[PDB]
Amino acid sequence: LILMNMEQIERASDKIAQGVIIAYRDMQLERDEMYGYVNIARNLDGFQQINLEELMRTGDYAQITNMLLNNQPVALVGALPFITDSSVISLVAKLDATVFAQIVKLRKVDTLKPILYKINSDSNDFYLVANYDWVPTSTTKVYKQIPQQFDFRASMHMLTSNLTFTVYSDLLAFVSADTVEPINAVAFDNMRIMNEL
């Protein structure tokens, strides 16, 4: 049960994402009911995948370094913390693309914290989206899932059990055990254990 539901439980977490695609082309921010505009990837199709756990374990950063230096599109896969940025100016400043040089510098992936943009009317600078003609884009996407909606039909169940019972532990407490007088105790052969009397 736990193994089959692992991926669903993990993707329900609000503090880790399932990866980050670095695509050095400009990709439109997706329109999601939970965020507004969000640089969210539904899947990793079309990108080379580098497993961050394997990269951490090996310590060989030659491929990741070569790809980051040469601006080679890639998908870094692994449970990652992310920064939720609601600032339109941050998106215009392209700060989501500035978070991967520390991988090359430190040869570490435990501090990689990609930016997840959440641009909506609650943003202080949302007018920039509303009052101007342009498509909000970013070069990075965060591989994360959307929460499952609550459905009453799919959640209402009937749980069945017994009305009541009593569980007992000491069964031999229910046995009344007596013994014959030791003078009369017999052995397997039906004669007295001690016959010298």
Partner 1 sequence: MDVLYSLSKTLKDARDKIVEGTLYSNVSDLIQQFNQMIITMNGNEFQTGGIGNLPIRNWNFDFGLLGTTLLNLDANYVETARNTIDYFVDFVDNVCMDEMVRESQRNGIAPQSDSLRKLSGIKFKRINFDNSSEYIENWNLQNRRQRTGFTFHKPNIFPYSASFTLNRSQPAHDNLMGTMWLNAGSEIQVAGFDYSCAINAPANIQQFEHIVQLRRVLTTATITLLPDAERFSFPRVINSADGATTWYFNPVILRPNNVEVEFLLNGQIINTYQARFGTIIARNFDTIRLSFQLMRPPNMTPAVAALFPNAQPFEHHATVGLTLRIESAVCESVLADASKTMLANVTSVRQEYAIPVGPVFPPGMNWTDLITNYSPSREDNLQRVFTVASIRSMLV
Partner 2 sequence: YPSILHPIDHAFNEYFLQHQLVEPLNNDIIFNYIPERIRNDVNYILNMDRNLPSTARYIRPNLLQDRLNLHDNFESLWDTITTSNYILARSVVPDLKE
Minimum distance from residue 4 beta carbon to partner 1 (Å): 6
Minimum distance from residue 167 beta carbon to partner 1 (Å): 19
Residue 152 interacts with partner 1 (CB under 8 A): yes or no: yes
Residue 1 interacts with partner 1 (CB under 8 A): yes or no: yes
**Candidates 19-27, 115-123, 128-136, 153-161; binding stretch for partner 1 (CB under 8 A):** 153-161
Residue 177 interacts with partner 1 (CB under 8 A): yes or no: no
The token pair at 184 is 């009369």
- Identity of the residue, 31 or 42, whose beta carbon is nearer to partner 1 in the bound complex: 42
Residue 163 interacts with partner 1 (CB under 8 A): yes or no: no
Q: How many other C-beta atoms lie within 10 A of the C-beta of residue 171?
A: 7
Residue 174 interacts with partner 1 (CB under 8 A): yes or no: no
Minimum distance from residue 7 beta carbon to partner 1 (Å): 9
Residue 9 interacts with partner 2 (CB under 8 A): yes or no: yes
CA 123, CA 112: separation in Å to the nearest integer? 25
Contacts with partner 2 by CB under 8 A: the residue count is 31
- Rounded (10°) CA dihedral 165, 166, 169, 173: -130
CA-wise closest residue to 128 among 120, 140, 118? 120
Residue 158 interacts with partner 1 (CB under 8 A): yes or no: yes
**Sites for partner 2 among residues 150-189 (CB under 8 A):** 152, 154-161, 164-169, 171-172, 174-180, 185-186
Q: Are 52 and 112 spatial neighbours (Cβ–Cβ below 8 Å)?
A: yes
Angle at 115 between CA 136 and CA 145, to 5 degrees: 85
CA-wise closest residue to 140 among 6, 4, 23? 23
Residue 146 interacts with partner 2 (CB under 8 A): yes or no: no
Residue type, 91: L
Residues 6+ apart with CB under 8 A from 37: 29, 30, 31, 117, 118, 119, 120, 129, 136
Residue 156 interacts with partner 1 (CB under 8 A): yes or no: yes
Name the residues that contact partner 2, by CB under 8 A: 1, 5, 8-9, 152, 154-161, 164-169, 171-172, 174-180, 185-186, 190
